[PDB]
């Protein structure tokens, strides 16, 4: 099935319709926890038992046409769009920030062990209010240390604000929903206290 689950520890907006993708507001530069979980039932991928996997994280534009045309705005002194807060992280092995892709980081982890990566996002949605996508692609190696066999990809939709802006936008969403009729409130999903990433197409290259 789906061998892993990734949980971004930030609440979703309460102003999204029932069956639409979640939207999560983040503050620029704030460390956010992403829990890396084994989602396998008994028996799946025993080759993973006792080995590590590699996850590659990207922050890209959520709209596909905007990503197709403006991807280089996020890719690239010392000005990164995505970074790993290594001192706060747990179970994060050999973390690396790609010096040529300022919106990409990677690390190894053991799905049998507690694993929480903390990330900071430094691009702001209004410097282009466009949504971004946090995407994770996860790989195994086959005995030569090359983590190149794709296992799983998932992603979530975010907007990033200058700090406190995410709290402000979440408050505006709450106060907008409070004004709506009962019959219209029913058409929206509640805010969830974490953001569970959902399966997506693999990134077209490793």
From Swiss-Prot:
Grh/CP2 DB domain span: 1-206
Basic and acidic residues bias spans: 164-188
Region (Disordered): 164-191
Domain of life: Eukaryota
Signal peptide location: none
Recorded coiled-coil stretches: none
Localization (cell): Nucleus
Family of this protein: Belongs to the grh/CP2 family. CP2 subfamily.
Assembly description: Binds to DNA as a dimer. Interacts with UBP1 and PIAS1, and is probably part of a complex containing TFCP2, UBP1 and PIAS1. Component of the SSP (stage selector protein) complex, which appears to be a heteromer of TFCP2 and 2 copies of NFE4.
Known role: Binds a variety of cellular promoters including fibrinogen, alpha-globin promoters. Activation of the alpha-globin promoter in erythroid cells is via synergistic interaction with UBP1. Functions as part of the SSP (stage selector protein) complex. Facilitates the interaction of the gamma-globin genes with enhancer elements contained in the locus control region in fetal erythroid cells. Interacts by binding to the stage selector element (SSE) in the proximal gamma-globin promoter.
Protein name: Alpha-globin transcription factor CP2
Taxonomic source organism: Mus musculus (Mouse)
Gene designation per UniProt: Tfcp2
Boundaries of the shown chain within the full protein: 64 to 283 of 502
